[PDB]
Amino acid sequence: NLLIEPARIEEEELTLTILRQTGGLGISIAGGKGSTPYKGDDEGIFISRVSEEGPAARAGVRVGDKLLEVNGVALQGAEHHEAVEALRGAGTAVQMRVWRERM
Amino acid sequence: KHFRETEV
C-alpha cells in the first residue's frame, strides 16, 4: 500500500492565555486604525515582539500573530491606544485570540 | 502617520 502523505496546517485562529507577570505580558503590539500598517494595508493589531522566556512566549504567542480579541472583546477597528488599554486592563489571565498565518 | 509600537 502507498505511503501516507502528511497533512499541512495552512493557518489557524487560536486562543493563548498569558499570565501577567510583574513586568507585563512580555510582548509589544504594533498597528492600529489610522497608523502605518504592520503588514500590507492591514491596520489591525499584531504582536510585533515577544520577550524570550517571558509570559507570552510560555503561553505560545508568536511574532506576527494578529490580535483579534482580548478577553473576548474584539479589536477590529481599534486605534493603537485602545488596544494598549485593553491589554493593560485585562487582569491576571489574558485570553488572546490570534490569527496565525505562518506555521 | 506613524508606525505605532508599544511594550505591554
CA distance A39 to B4: 13
- The method recorded for this entry reads X-ray
Q: Look at chain A and report how many structural domains it folds into.
A: 1
Given the DSSP bridges, would you call strands A27-31 and A45-50 parallel, antiparallel or unpaired? Answer: antiparallel
CATH number for the domain spanning A79: value is 2.30.42.10
Å from A56 to nearest chain B CA?
Answer: 10
CA distance A80 to A71: 17
Burial environment of residue A83 by CB neighbours within 10 A (0 to 12, 13 to 18, 19 or more)? buried
Å from A15 to nearest chain B CA?
Answer: 18
Structural domain range at position A41: 12-100
Is residue A42 in some structural domain? yes
Grid cell for residue A93: 489571565
Is residue A77 in some structural domain? yes
Nearest residue of B to residue A88, measured between CA atoms? B8
CA distance B2 to A84: 16
Grid cell for residue A42: 492591514
Is residue A1 in some structural domain? no
DSSP-assigned letters across all residues of chain A: -PPPPPP----EEEEEEEE-BTTBSSEEEEE-TTS--SBTTB-SEEEEEE-TTSHHHHHT--TT-EEEEETTEE-TT--HHHHHHHHHTS-SEEEEEEEE---
| Closest partner CB to A48 (pick from B1, B2, B5) | B5
CA distance A44 to A31: 6
Is residue A29 in some structural domain? yes
Å from A12 to nearest chain B CA?
Answer: 24
Beta carbons within 8 Å of A23's beta carbon, 6+ residues apart: A54
| Closest partner CB to B6 (pick from A28, A34, A36) | A28
Calculate Rg over the CA atoms of chain B. 7
Is residue A3 in some structural domain? no
From chain B, pick out residues whose CB is under 8 angstroms from the CB of A88. 8
Is residue A7 in some structural domain? no
Cell 491576571 -> residue: A92
